[PDB]
Amino acid sequence: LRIIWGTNVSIQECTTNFRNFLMSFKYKFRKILDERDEELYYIKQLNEMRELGTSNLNLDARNLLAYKQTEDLYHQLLNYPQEVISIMDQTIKDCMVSLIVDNNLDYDLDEIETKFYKVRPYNVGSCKGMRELNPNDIDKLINLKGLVLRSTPVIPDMKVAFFKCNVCDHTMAVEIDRGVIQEPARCERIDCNEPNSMSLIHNRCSFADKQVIKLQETPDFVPDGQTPHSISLCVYDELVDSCRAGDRIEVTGTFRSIPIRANSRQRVLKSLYKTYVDVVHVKKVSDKRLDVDTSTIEQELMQNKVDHNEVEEVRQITDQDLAKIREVAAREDLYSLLARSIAPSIYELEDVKKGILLQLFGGTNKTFTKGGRYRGDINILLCGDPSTSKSQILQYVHKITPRGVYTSGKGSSAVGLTAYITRDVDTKQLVLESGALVLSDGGVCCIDEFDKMSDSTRSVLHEVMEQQTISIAKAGIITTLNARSSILASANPIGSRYNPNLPVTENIDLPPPLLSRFDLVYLVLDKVDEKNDRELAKHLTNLYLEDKPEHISQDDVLPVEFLTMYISYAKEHIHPIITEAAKTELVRAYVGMRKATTRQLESMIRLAEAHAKMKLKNVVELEDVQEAVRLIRSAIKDYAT
């Protein structure tokens, strides 16, 4: 019997059990968990990983929950994550060498023995924010889900406590013991005996890498009277430059505790221990929404490649799903099926939904040698009678988009939009905080009640809507940053109940140019009549008829997952270059519609590029101009007046 004091964990028994489970796991969860070809789920990763020289590996929890001989390992890695993982770091190499026994290989053995190994349990049991963590359940594997606010600099830590003897031309070496250094005051008595003659040098020693990340907690349930909170944590080396502001995150780690000094003067501490979290893994993507622009993050991609840390940054594809995508693109009913699928719970609003999907496509991202940049984003505005699904659509877009923020009415100011300067509550130093305009850098920006919002705030957007670059000049901060976010907002009519017989360009309580520069606008007038109302009424009542709208899937509605993966692949893989035929229709359509400024030309070209991106065309074609102009005219409803 071998055991750890105050513990029920065995080293060799756990090693044997781990090896047995590793050798025996073939989609056991597809059989036990549910009803859902392949073989040896786990073993492929370990077979492939050897030749690429990587000291990392991921790991699930459902697999241990499924396999017969890992249920007890479940609670033991739960309660004692660090100890169980230190065991696994040896068990993995044991299995590696016991699996090479059945193979003859070129002499690569110089590396594996000197190597190290580590794991990353990522998909684990759910946790209910931090309110659940009363002190009974400290120091345990945990999970969470929140966004990023603030990032700190690098904290070095004493890892090799070098030491310089003052005489006898001798150095000295000593290492850390549970996070402290005990300088040997002596001077190597044999050669010289000076009980307290030694020095310290920093350049010699080795240092660790640590960061601290301020995070905003976003739970799924909250009590009666809850409010947002902030937490601090700590990541360590090989994970630097991974998470930052503007990313939603599902994370894993270990809740912990620590006291703090009462001053920089003596050792007297607080009866209350400041809490924190130490990271184990970070999940940077999820299934219910697409991912970041790939061309926007090339530098970080290459940096991570060089650093040999390859946590997920973009979703991966399958050839069978690629073929399925090409098959689905063959049929011609895409152009309406996408609209029917974006929001099955709402009446048609066909052009509105079509424009939303084209915006999600985005469009073109070109650049010049040094003096140009043209990003894929077309500002959108809504307007019309209230009591419709405008707010519902906006909230849906905010949910489904990964990188965006919601702003409402006059509750906002220029200071709280662009960069603003504040102070930390612990370090008591001048630290900054990112603004909502920049937080959505690439994605969606949602506004509602665009009319009552203050003029001071309404001033800033003039340059955002053009060059996507905010500028800042205040205390100790002079830099121009990037705000590639997109704009998608609603507007309210002048007065109330609208005015049919009046020019709508003057019936909004909003100046001409601010409305004209919008790439496209949509109108939600009422036009009450049957054949458009009874159908809507049933459409919405059948939603409630069921406990949850799953019968809504009828009438040719796609699932979210394949739709999103198709969108992501199309966004990341194709680049339609402008063509020649579209010119003679685009120019004429623009000139004829002028009878109201040149910005609609940019709107039309950027939307036709998104249309070409749809259908997976690598080239524009004349037809997109036709759809763009026709939809613009229908959106403004030219026929009425």
Binding site: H202, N203, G442, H462, T469, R517, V587
Partner: protein, 539 residues
């Protein structure tokens, strides 16, 4: 371990320096000139030698440098000792400096980790402040507290507190010491603040910054508000600002095991930041005579210049001419009383939105030697002008590099002119009435000098500019600031299909990646030198 390796490295490096000489024969085989380099250095007694990485790394297959770079400090004393030995060998009151420039690799501030400690590493960034020259403690004498015995040694980098050995060891307490000021050596010092560069920033990101320090004669090569390419070693310094943070904190303590019967523990807390040092820095960011001679001979080159300053923009020749003449300043020395003029000039434009006013801004800021793009609204006078520090970090204050304070002999392009506050327009009026500024806070007074030529963008009250009314009723800004302006421009559109078709043609053609539609007479490369030559012609 390097008690053996270091001297071998010294010998190998001095042999490297000696075996090479000045061959450079007919621009052929390049032999390293370090001998004559140190000779020419001894000509003026400067002792600030330079070294190039490529030549050093050529010989010995570069494994030498491979190990030296990561273990730089462990051998640096021996490197300087070998340099001294070579000086003794081949040349006839001695403090030296060294540097390594033209490194192959570049690391941003985010590309620095804890495995580059004491290792040479090239960085590039930006400057936002400087500091005060304060002579630093190179060597310093001490004396015994019971006699005149002087010790002319020094503990230099850190641990600058106490020597031990006394020439006459008969002393009740030889542990502590006295000090002295004159029998000592000193060398210059300077501090700056380094900053991120815009063209390499991530999303949701602030310009993460840190502090770097200089030494020796290489000082005076720093500059506020400029991009620079530093090179040095990963020095680190203590700090306590990192308190109150999670995790366990390392702490030092002398041992009390093995020897016994001898806060009593003398526990010292350790927690360090990662600053940087610089051995050398450079400012980042001929047949030209024949080129410019050929250019000048033409007559319509005026029109060529006018039309070449904004190919990315269409028409509006007035804006082109105004921007071309803005960079040129007028002679401000034309007085006899000593009361002076605002030699340079000012510009401003008007026009409804859906116009290309901002294109001119972005062009000029992306081409100007000195310039800055700011908000115009989201900015305080403290941001435009300089808000200074009040006796922080022990030393004295220092004048911050003001944003508007910048643009010395340059431009300060500012957008969104309508929404400016009251105080900021008051400050701009003060800065414009004279070519001087005055500041004060916490009792301190300041006096600056600058000749700024402002180009800004107007925004009428309602956006619509009533053609039948006067300028004042629509401009909405007080008479003094409205005045002092040499030029006013108006840019409003009208229905003209023949030209609008071609305008849309250009706009859509711009959506052809790096097309040839912007074919100018010539490029910024030679335009900048033309501007530099023309800035001082004195008509």
């Amino acid at each position: 371990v390097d008690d053996v390796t270091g001297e071998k490295v010294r010998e190998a490096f001095e042999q490297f320096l000696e075996d090479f000489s000045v061959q450079s024969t007919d621009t052929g085989e390049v032999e390293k000139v370090y001998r004559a380099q140190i000779e020419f250095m001894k000509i003026y007694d400067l002792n600030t030698i330079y070294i190039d990485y490529q030549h050093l790394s050529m010989r010995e297959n570069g494994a030498l440098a491979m190990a030296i770079s990561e273990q730089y400090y462990r051998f640096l004393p021996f490197l300087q000792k070998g340099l001294r030995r070579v000086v003794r060998k081949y040349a006839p009151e001695r403090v030296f400096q060294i540097s390594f420039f033209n490194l192959p690799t570049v690391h941003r501030i985010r590309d620095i980790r804890s495995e580059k400690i004491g290792s040479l590493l090239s960085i590039s960034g930006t400057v936002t402040r400087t500091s005060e020259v304060r002579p630093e403690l190179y060597k310093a004498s001490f004396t015994c507290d019971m006699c005149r015995a002087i010790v002319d040694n020094v503990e230099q980098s850190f641990k600058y507190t106490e020597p031990t050995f006394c020439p006459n060891p008969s002393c009740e307490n030889r542990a502590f010491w006295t000090l002295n000021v004159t029998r000592s050596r000193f060398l210059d010092w300077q501090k700056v603040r380094i900053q991120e560069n815009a063209n390499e920033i991530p999303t949701g990101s602030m310009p993460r910054t840190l502090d770097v320090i200089l030494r020796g004669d290489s000082v005076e090569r720093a500059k506020p508000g400029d991009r620079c390419k530093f090179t040095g070693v990963e020095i680190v310094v203590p700090d306590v600002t990192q308190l109150g943070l999670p995790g366990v904190k390392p702490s030092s303590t002398l041992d009390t095991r093995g020897i016994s019967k001898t806060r009593s523990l003398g526990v010292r807390d350790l927690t360090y930041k990662i600053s940087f040092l610089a051995c050398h820095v450079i400012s980042i960011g001929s047949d030209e005579i024949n080129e410019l001679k050929e250019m000048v001979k033409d007559e319509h080159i005026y029109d060529k210049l006018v039309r070449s300053i904004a190919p990315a923009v269409f028409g509006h020749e007035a804006v082109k001419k105004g921007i071309l003449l803005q960079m040129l300043g007028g002679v401000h020395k034309s007085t006899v009383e000593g009361i002076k003029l605002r030699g340079d000039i000012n510009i401003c434009v008007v026009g409804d939105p859906s116009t290309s006013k901002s294109q001119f801004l972005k062009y000029v800021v992306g081409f100007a030697p000195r310039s800055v793009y700011t908000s115009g609204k989201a900015s305080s006078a403290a941001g435009l002008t300089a808000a200074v520090v009040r006796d922080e970090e022990g030393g004295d204050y220092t004048i911050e590099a003001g944003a508007l304070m910048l643009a010395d002999n340059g431009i300060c392009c500012i957008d969104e002119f309508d929404k400016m506050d009251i105080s900021d327009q008051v400050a701009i009026h003060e800065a414009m009435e004279q070519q001087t500024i005055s500041i004060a806070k916490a009792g301190i007074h300041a006096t600056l000098n600058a000749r700024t030529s402002i180009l800004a963008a107007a925004n009428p009250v309602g956006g619509r500019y009533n053609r039948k009314l006067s300028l004042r009723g629509n401009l909405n800004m007080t008479a003094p600031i409205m005045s002092r302006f040499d030029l006013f421009f108006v840019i409003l559109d009208d229905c003209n299909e023949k030209i609008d078709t071609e305008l849309a043609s250009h706009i859509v053609d711009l959506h052809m990646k790096r097309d040839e539609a912007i074919e100018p007479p010539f490029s910024a490369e030679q335009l900048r030198r033309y501007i530099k030559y023309a800035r001082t012609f004195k008509p």
